Amino acid sequence: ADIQTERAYQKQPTIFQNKKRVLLGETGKEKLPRYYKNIGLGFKTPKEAIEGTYIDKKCPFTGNVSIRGRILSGVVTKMKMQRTIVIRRDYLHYIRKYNRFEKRHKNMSVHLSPCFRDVQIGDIVTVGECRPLSKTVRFNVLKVTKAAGTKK
Amino acid sequence: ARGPKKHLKRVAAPKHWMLDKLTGVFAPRPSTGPHKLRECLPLIIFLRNKLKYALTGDEVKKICMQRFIKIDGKVRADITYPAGFMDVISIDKTGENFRLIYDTKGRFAVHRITPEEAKYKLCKVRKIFVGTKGIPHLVTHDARTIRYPDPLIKMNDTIQIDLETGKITDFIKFDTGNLCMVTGGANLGRIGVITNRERHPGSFDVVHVKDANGNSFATRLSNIFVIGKGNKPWISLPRGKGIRLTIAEERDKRLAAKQSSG
Amino acid sequence: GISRDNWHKRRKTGGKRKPYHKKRKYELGRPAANTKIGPRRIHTVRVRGGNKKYRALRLDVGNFSWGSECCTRKTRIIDVVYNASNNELVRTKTLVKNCIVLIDSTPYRQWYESHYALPLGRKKGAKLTPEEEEILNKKRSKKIQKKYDERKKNAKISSLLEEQFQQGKLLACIASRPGQCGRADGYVLEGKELEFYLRKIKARKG
RNA sequence: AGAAGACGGUCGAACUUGACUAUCUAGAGGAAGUAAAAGUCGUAACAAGGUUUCCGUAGGUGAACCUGCGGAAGGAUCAUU
RNA sequence: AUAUUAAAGUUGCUGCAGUUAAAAAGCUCGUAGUUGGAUCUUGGGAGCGGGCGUCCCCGCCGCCUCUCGGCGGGGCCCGAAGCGUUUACUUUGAAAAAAUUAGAGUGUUCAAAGCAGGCCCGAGCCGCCUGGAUACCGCAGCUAGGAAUAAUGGAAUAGGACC
RNA sequence: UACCUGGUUGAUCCUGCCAGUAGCAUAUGCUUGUCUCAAAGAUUAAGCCAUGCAUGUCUAAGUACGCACGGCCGGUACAGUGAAACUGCGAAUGGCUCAUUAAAUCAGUUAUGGUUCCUUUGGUCGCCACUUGGAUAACUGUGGUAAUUCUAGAGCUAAUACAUGCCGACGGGCGCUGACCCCCUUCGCGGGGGGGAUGCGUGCAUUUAUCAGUGGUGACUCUAGAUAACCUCGGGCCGAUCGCACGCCCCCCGUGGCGGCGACGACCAUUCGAACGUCUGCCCUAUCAACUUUCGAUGGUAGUCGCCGUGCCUACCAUGGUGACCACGGGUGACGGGGAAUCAGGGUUCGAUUCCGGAGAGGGAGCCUGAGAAACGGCUACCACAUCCAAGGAAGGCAGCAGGCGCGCA
RNA sequence: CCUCUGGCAUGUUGGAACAAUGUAGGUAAGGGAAGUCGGCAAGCCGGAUCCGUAACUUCGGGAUAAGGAUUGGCUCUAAGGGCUGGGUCGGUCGCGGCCGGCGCCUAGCAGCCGACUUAGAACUGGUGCGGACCAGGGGAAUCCGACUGUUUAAUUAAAACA
Ligand SMILES: [Mg+2]
Ligand SMILES: [Mg+2]
Ligand SMILES: [Mg+2]
Ligand SMILES: [Mg+2]
Ligand SMILES: [Mg+2]
Ligand SMILES: [Mg+2]
Ligand SMILES: [Mg+2]
Ligand SMILES: [Mg+2]
Ligand SMILES: [Mg+2]
Ligand SMILES: [Mg+2]
Ligand SMILES: [Mg+2]
Ligand SMILES: [Mg+2]
Ligand SMILES: [Mg+2]
Ligand SMILES: [Mg+2]
Ligand SMILES: [Mg+2]
Ligand SMILES: [Mg+2]
Ligand SMILES: [Mg+2]
Ligand SMILES: [Mg+2]
Ligand SMILES: [Mg+2]
Ligand SMILES: [Mg+2]
Ligand SMILES: [Mg+2]
Ligand SMILES: [Mg+2]
Ligand SMILES: [Mg+2]
Ligand SMILES: [Mg+2]
Ligand SMILES: [Mg+2]
Ligand SMILES: [Mg+2]
Ligand SMILES: [Mg+2]
Ligand SMILES: [Mg+2]
Ligand SMILES: [Mg+2]
Ligand SMILES: [Mg+2]
Ligand SMILES: [Mg+2]
């Protein structure tokens, strides 16, 4: 229940939820000794990851997914895909003949670990490239901002 | 490309081989080896283009195959064996012995050296290891998996390897105030002491290097390669000293040599 | 052939791609092993770059690790019970990664009797009288008794497991990839997972 | 140790049969356009072109055109006490 | 003959037209698009350098940090960090296949080319002295400086620091 | 060189074009003394192909009993040439052509902490072993077929081909097990300390699970280690291997040790790469405005396959994904690029074509070997062409180089 | 179409034969409208599920357009619903009540019942499967009348009347 919303059992790998024969109730206070890692490039692992109980293999903190290569920002545009968001990166493309630019918008499907709550849309969101992890998705969200305009 | 490639067009060849347009459609293409194809002096070129020791392809073959040439102390009958940076080529029936150390253009100057000196070489450590049963390793820049290093070397330190025995005989640590040659890109074959290193996490590390004659530059760590402690280096250096005249200064030095000296 | 490769399917926008070349021996697949229960039948396969993939077509035994007590004896894979990919693969008794199988408890039984010097799998007086007494019967005393006294509340095995032993079949999750490697080496379901699959099995039975 | 063989699976040419789509074309009859030309009928238009012309829209007429209504000055009145 | 560029400011970014020569929607609303007023650190201060003082030039007033590392108490200021609010912009640097181009050198007899050549020398030197440069390489990506211009933020049913 | 002249008028000033003017390629006409360079079947028909040639290869060091030559020497196999044939490698390069292919290829940029890598180089390489089994090729000899770089049956015969398989090695070393034994203390159970025969393991790699956290990085579920087992069983692996030149010395006589190369392998690093991924860039078109999706469209979960990462595929869920910032569809006298022609400064047009990258071998498809091909101077089918047949059958692919036919202005 | 309840004796007769002509049914090799005034007659088609659907148009239609595929038996899977249940701890009063305090499944879980469908999968048979029964042949065009309706009881159903 709650966490196991799937047909197979979901567990973090890399921990053995079993070794126990001592007093003071069944298991500890934290109960399951949670796996997590830090992602580096001075991206702060969230509390919602380490304190949090969920699991997600594609979470760049609490699962198998190295972050590597390109890092960007977008802005959250659609949240409807489960565990993922489309984000709009916008840029000014130079034509030379006319010594001017044009708007251009590539919109990347992006993995969004459930460590992040309170991600509204219109929310600038840093993403770090990774190995592919869906037909279209390579980029996980790493830090989120929201404050451009509406509220904390 | 149904598999691998077994040829190399002239023109498509490395620029620093000095290989001219009309002569042939092809260049040798170094054999697979310790150094990277596009970082070599294919033994043939080193001879019949740069020592004029052979005339043809055939004449190099015949020089090579009397077991005359001895590349970092062994013997090699491949004409396309990639010799390269901080190697030797001992040629014996003459007692020449060279090194292949870069020119301030970036061409491997035919640099004659003494038979003492021709014992040791120098190497950059690429990666330190730990293999099975805890036994650590190095890997040199030129594919010498050394085993059991002085637990201190770590990557980018340069070593003075013996050659004939093999194995490390003391070393230099990559730090500020150490003589740094660069082995790549724009500043190829320049030499100055370091000054300053800048770690960019994920990107790669830019490194500054100040020349003896006041001039400065930067690079990306990979190409960099130390050759001693501060001003004094641990090897011979070709005349020029890796110091990089401006094109104006070079023209002046060419002009001054002419007319006056004779 | 039977190709793994993106070239053959539409873009993110939805429009058709075009085939810019023909299929490539590496842009390749093979037909599935779908290895069964039965007495051993393995086929080796030449793969890319030489090397060998040791494709199980049948299989029987497996090297299952009881994690909590740390013993990992080889045993029979008696039957497949549940597979959360697809039901039909349970029905077939097809062996895959993360299949829930049954395995005979007998080497874990033998081990536990050895180790903690306790009976496992309750009975009246047939296993207890001849064999366990012989396993016990302390002609040394002092050292060995102190050891198996030190094997304390420590023996206290899980309830769900204990029931399975006295039945005689343990639910075990396969960790290997039988079609690729050849083996069926897995691990015994224990506590939280076991409780989960047992419930899923009960729900299946109706 | 193992060849021929067959059950099923798989990729799948190829052929038939539709289906849609692009290019190319034959066609009685119709109806335009341009060009030649030493025709025929008138004279619409440019001068108040002999009924200002013109626009939109209706109907009519061998043909240019004519007429109705509302516009236009690109009018033949920048002006009328 | 035909394709094509310049002529063509007859396709127009630089740089054309739109009363009458072809040309402005009958009129108004209107979303994307494009375009958006002014406004926040400045005079000054102190010196090296040039034509008692005046007029032109050149390093300084990246702040804070010491919660972090050290080139039984400490200093000293560097690695880290509140990274430059978040970009654009500019300058420098790093990376950039060669050939082609531009362009050094060099009497291929000249030249287009080519990459060589040149000497000392009676040859007795049994050789030697040199080349095989540099420039450019959109945009994007990478580095460090600058912070006018233009965006973009923050404290307003309250929030910044403080043994 | 930041250049304009002719043409509407009876004349004028304009808008405006047409016509001239100069380059640059393709053709063609006329013409042509010398010399240095030098493109050349791209445009049409990725149309068809007569003939011939274009990929084979041996060292001192893989197997020599052709008897084809000869030794110098016999008889201790072998001595020196050596066709032949088995063995190994190579044939994935090169060469051609530009049909396709429009965010595809391609370029710069990075990732592989998501993989494979023949070789090259460097690490690793503790009772048949005084060396075992049987097989076949050439050679020999009967053939069969009309006919092929068809082959069968019989004789033999070698291997680094194919198989099998041991000495080493220390009843010893370290993990568990422990017949037991000894010392101290205690009223004694007990408590503490030691020693210890006999068993099982007695690991490089494999597959799985647990434990701990030598060397490492913005960056581990990394390396390394420990425990538990497993063998991806003969078709996991090295475990433990053939060949050549000199020719040495034993507290010792017939034995035992010895250097210098070749060749070979499992693993690790290297190299040559390959392969997939990240960011940003492409011509015309709206007489293409909506497209995708239970025949994968976009996500999720667990597998499958694959060298690996991913709807690659399968199940089950979720209902997503792209679009006026031009999706989606259509076209291209479209291979991408480096680059070429013009040019003041801007630009416009070209780029089949010697470098680089892609794709293709008439068309489609499927595969064998191999490190590497979805190979075409490899096969297997079909379709389209076509060649001998003694009519049962058999063979084939110039967008290699020459050359031919055709097409065509070329 | 077959059956029970109930009902009948084959419709104003029986028997024996099995000729021609018929009436009513069927089937036919190869061809497939060559037949004939004329496809008259018969034949094709037919159910369902899943795809797929043109011209034209009064924009409603055309439309079951056309054109395709599947269908059995067997053994399984998945998907769809209802009812009832916790006021447990403490007190006190008679398993039941009353009071006070927790709990409060408020993501619900547990036990007990019950129609019927739909999808998917395996296997299987001499490719047979809407097995009898039931049950559209389509298409392109022209003429007439818009249509539904009505009409000559007993030769005219139409283009006639409305
Ligand atoms: Mg411009
Ligand atoms: Mg006349
Ligand atoms: Mg007018
Ligand atoms: Mg022009
Ligand atoms: Mg101009
Ligand atoms: Mg104009
Ligand atoms: Mg006008
Ligand atoms: Mg107007
Ligand atoms: Mg403003
Ligand atoms: Mg005139
Ligand atoms: Mg002209
Ligand atoms: Mg090639
Ligand atoms: Mg590689
Ligand atoms: Mg085309
Ligand atoms: Mg090419
Ligand atoms: Mg051809
Ligand atoms: Mg190919
Ligand atoms: Mg092929
Ligand atoms: Mg050919
Ligand atoms: Mg009757
Ligand atoms: Mg009767
Ligand atoms: Mg009657
Ligand atoms: Mg018939
Ligand atoms: Mg007739
Ligand atoms: Mg007829
Ligand atoms: Mg009829
Ligand atoms: Mg119809
Ligand atoms: Mg009519
Ligand atoms: Mg009617
Ligand atoms: Mg009647
Ligand atoms: Mg009638």
Curated annotation (Swiss-Prot), chain A:
The modification Omega-N-methylarginine is found at R68. Gene3D superfamilies: 2.40.50.1000. It comes from the Eukaryota. Pfam families: Ribosomal_S17 (PF00366), Ribosomal_S17_N (PF16205). The modification Phosphoserine is found at S66, S109. One of its GO terms (cellular component) is nucleolus. GO terms for biological process: translation. A lipid is attached at C59 (S-palmitoyl cysteine). The keyword Acetylation applies. SUPFAM superfamilies: Nucleic acid-binding proteins. It is found in: Cytoplasm; Nucleus, Nucleolus. The modification N-acetylalanine is found at A1. GO terms for molecular function: rRNA binding; structural constituent of ribosome. The modification Citrulline is found at R21. Keywords: Acetylation, Citrullination, Cytoplasm, Lipoprotein, Methylation, Nucleus, Palmitate, Phosphoprotein, Ribonucleoprotein, Ribosomal protein, RNA-binding, rRNA-binding. Citrullinated by PADI4. Signal peptide: none annotated. InterPro entries: NA-bd_OB-fold, Ribosomal_uS17, Ribosomal_uS17_arc/euk, Ribosomal_uS17_CS, Ribosomal_uS17_N. The modification N6-acetyllysine is found at K37, K44, K57. Component of the small ribosomal subunit. Part of the small subunit (SSU) processome, composed of more than 70 proteins and the RNA chaperone small nucleolar RNA (snoRNA) U3. Component of the small ribosomal subunit. The ribosome is a large ribonucleoprotein complex responsible for the synthesis of proteins in the cell. Part of the small subunit (SSU) processome, first precursor of the small eukaryotic ribosomal subunit. During the assembly of the SSU processome in the nucleolus, many ribosome biogenesis factors, an RNA chaperone and ribosomal proteins associate with the nascent pre-rRNA and work in concert to generate RNA folding, modifications, rearrangements and cleavage as well as targeted degradation of pre-ribosomal RNA by the RNA exosome. Belongs to the universal ribosomal protein uS17 family. This is Small ribosomal subunit protein uS17. The lineage of its organism: Eukaryota, Metazoa, Chordata, Craniata, Vertebrata.
Curated annotation (Swiss-Prot), chain B:
GO terms for biological process: translation. Coiled coil: none annotated. One of its GO terms (cellular component) is cytosolic ribosome. It holds the Pfam family KOW. One of its GO terms (molecular function) is structural constituent of ribosome. Residues 41-103 form the S4 RNA-binding domain. It is found in: Cytoplasm; Nucleus, Nucleolus. It comes from the Eukaryota. SMART domains: S4. The modification N6-acetyllysine is found at K232. There is a cross-link at K229 (Glycyl lysine isopeptide (Lys-Gly) (interchain with G-Cter in SUMO2)). Component of the small ribosomal subunit. Part of the small subunit (SSU) processome, composed of more than 70 proteins and the RNA chaperone small nucleolar RNA (snoRNA) U3. Identified in a IGF2BP1-dependent mRNP granule complex containing untranslated mRNAs. Belongs to the eukaryotic ribosomal protein eS4 family. Component of the small ribosomal subunit. The ribosome is a large ribonucleoprotein complex responsible for the synthesis of proteins in the cell. Part of the small subunit (SSU) processome, first precursor of the small eukaryotic ribosomal subunit. During the assembly of the SSU processome in the nucleolus, many ribosome biogenesis factors, an RNA chaperone and ribosomal proteins associate with the nascent pre-rRNA and work in concert to generate RNA folding, modifications, rearrangements and cleavage as well as targeted degradation of pre-ribosomal RNA by the RNA exosome. HAMAP family: Ribosomal_eS4 (MF_00485). This is Small ribosomal subunit protein eS4. It comes from Oryctolagus cuniculus (Rabbit).
Swiss-Prot record, chain C:
The modification Phosphoserine is found at S159. There is a cross-link at K169, K192 (Glycyl lysine isopeptide (Lys-Gly) (interchain with G-Cter in SUMO2)). GO terms for molecular function: structural constituent of ribosome. Residues 1-26 are annotated as: Disordered. PROSITE patterns: RIBOSOMAL_S8E (PS01193). Disulfide bonds: none annotated. The gene is RPS8. GO terms for biological process: translation. This is Small ribosomal subunit protein eS8. Its main location: cytoplasm. GO terms for cellular component: cytosolic ribosome; membrane; nucleolus; ribonucleoprotein complex. It is found in: Cytoplasm; Membrane; Nucleus, Nucleolus. Keywords: Acetylation, Cytoplasm, Isopeptide bond, Lipoprotein, Membrane, Myristate, Nucleus, Phosphoprotein, Ribonucleoprotein, Ribosomal protein, Ubl conjugation. Residues 7-25 have a biased composition (Basic residues). The modification Phosphothreonine is found at T129. Belongs to the eukaryotic ribosomal protein eS8 family. It is a lipid-anchor. The modification N6-acetyllysine is found at K36, K127. InterPro entries: Ribosomal_eS8 (IPR001047), Ribosomal_eS8_CS (IPR018283), Ribosomal_protein_eS8_euk (IPR042563), Ribosomal_Se8/biogenesis_NSA2 (IPR022309). Component of the small ribosomal subunit. The ribosome is a large ribonucleoprotein complex responsible for the synthesis of proteins in the cell. Part of the small subunit (SSU) processome, first precursor of the small eukaryotic ribosomal subunit. During the assembly of the SSU processome in the nucleolus, many ribosome biogenesis factors, an RNA chaperone and ribosomal proteins associate with the nascent pre-rRNA and work in concert to generate RNA folding, modifications, rearrangements and cleavage as well as targeted degradation of pre-ribosomal RNA by the RNA exosome. Component of the small ribosomal subunit. Identified in a IGF2BP1-dependent mRNP granule complex containing untranslated mRNAs. Part of the small subunit (SSU) processome, composed of more than 70 proteins and the RNA chaperone small nucleolar RNA (snoRNA) U3. A lipid is attached at G1 (N-myristoyl glycine). The lineage of its organism: Eukaryota, Metazoa, Chordata, Craniata, Vertebrata.
